[PDB]
Amino acid sequence: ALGMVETKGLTAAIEAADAMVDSANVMLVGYEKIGSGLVTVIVRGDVGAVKAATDAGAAAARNVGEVKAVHVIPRPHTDVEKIL
Amino acid sequence: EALGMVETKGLTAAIEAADAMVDSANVMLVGYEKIGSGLVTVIVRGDVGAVKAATDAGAAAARNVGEVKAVHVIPRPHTDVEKILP
Amino acid sequence: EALGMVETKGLTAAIEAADAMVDSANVMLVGYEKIGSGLVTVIVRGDVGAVKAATDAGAAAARNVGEVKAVHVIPRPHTDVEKILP
Amino acid sequence: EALGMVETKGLTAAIEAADAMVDSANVMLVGYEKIGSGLVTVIVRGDVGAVKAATDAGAAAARNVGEVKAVHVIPRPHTDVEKILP
Amino acid sequence: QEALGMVETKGLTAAIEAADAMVDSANVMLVGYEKIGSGLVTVIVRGDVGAVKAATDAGAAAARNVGEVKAVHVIPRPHTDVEKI
Amino acid sequence: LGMVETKGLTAAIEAADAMVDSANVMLVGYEKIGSGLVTVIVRGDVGAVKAATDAGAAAARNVGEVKAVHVIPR
């Protein structure tokens, strides 16, 4: 499963990442920068862990900065895997 | 041969469009491109009907996650365009 | 000989310009350049008449899908067309 | 060991925060990260009380030079967070 | 020679029209383009001071007709420390 | 350390050149952070830095926008 939390600002993103790893059995892949101050944090793991991680990351981050998106894909297509 | 693009503001929305597109239709995901200002384009190739179906599915899934800026299909792209694709 | 440029906000509009340019005239696609903030410049080259044709089609195609920031044609020595490019 | 962050718009504002942080308490400067759009994050590491003290001092100092966007402390961060630090 | 000339535009199209006008107008070397965000691009040339002044005025005037010129400047003999950026 | 931060690169290069020309400083940083912001950084004795940054800022204002001018002793 794939979990993403997207924030305005890097400080909110670091807090999401920490909360995600604190809250569930997930691997933190990293983050991506896309401009306009937006930062996407990415984690992988089984679907229940990714759901628990993204819900915890999004809730933590909101108190540090603005949360722009939160999403989980339980079983990404292989073509997606290839570009992640 | 057709080319389909969904451009979102936000990378979470683009990834959700990419996955919806490949899931929805017989299309190959070519890749994504970032150009700044939060803008991310995801590109698919396939027969024309498959790419219209993919891009409409991608755009609809993206809108539930984030913002869609642009959706377009070029049904018969010139061979030179392949040079600039991800 | 000339360079022709169409600069858009958005990559979808830039790819639609690119394909429309090479569809409309005997020009070669050089590629495209990103400067951040969603701004992309698609560059073609060829004979001056063909580049003028191409950039008129490309800007129109891009304005149908998105925003065009600039469209311009620069005549160049036929022995060193690309020397000024980034 | 605790991590402290001050995010500013503008680099001068950030370097001022860094100087203020390291002077104010027993903290190690981890580094700066840039995310574009003029935003820079300065990070320090130390014991939690030292980190709260530094970050306070850094933000106050930065506000006199530029704009402060975020100030935060994580008291007991996981090792994994390193993957994403400068 | 060693004078430095700079023309800064909003937009890459105006920068490349500046470079064409610059190299056409005088004996100068195009060093490159620098992107710094907010859509700003700087075009940098080197040459003797007379070539660089001519090149820079020609670039600024040519860019002004395609887009917006943000800065235009010539440094006849830059310090050695500056050569390092 | 002395810093001059500008909106525009041309103004930045002019500050750097004016600073090093005006005082006993060495150019030790040149950073881009986006949104057009460029910082040039010098090192020397406090007084040479205070006069460098003064001179850089003044020279850069004739060329473009200056956003910050700052001196950190130590």
Numbering used by the authors:
A (entry chain F): 5 to 88
B (entry chain D), C (entry chain E), D (entry chain B): 4 to 89
E (entry chain A): 3 to 87
F (entry chain C): 6 to 79
Provide text from the study.
The lysine 26 mutant is the most important to study structurally because Lys-26 is conserved in all shell proteins and contributes significantly to the interface between 2-fold related hexamers in the native crystals. Two crystal forms were obtained for this mutant using commercially available screens. There is clear electron density for residues 4–89 in nine copies of the PduA subunit across the two crystal forms, and the C-terminal residues, including the additional 23 residues, are not seen in the electron density maps. In the first form, strips of hexamers are formed, and in the second, sheets with rather poor hexamer-hexamer interactions are seen. For one of these mutants (K26D), crystals were obtained, and these crystals reveal more fragile hexamer-hexamer tiling than in native PduA in one crystal form (type II) and only one-dimensional tiling in the other (type I). The mutation K26D has a profound influence on the conformation of the neighboring Arg-79, such that this region of the protein no longer adopts a single conformation in the crystal, resulting in breaking of the 6-fold symmetry axis of the hexamer.
The 1,2-propanediol-utilizing microcompartment is assembled from seven different types of shell proteins, one of which is PduA. It is one of the more abundant components of the shell and intriguingly can form nanotubule-like structures when expressed on its own in the cytoplasm of Escherichia coli. The majority of shell proteins consist of a single BMC domain (Pfam 00936) in each subunit and assemble into hexamers. PduA has been shown to interact with the majority of the other shell proteins and, thus, could potentially act as a scaffold for the assembly of the microcompartment.
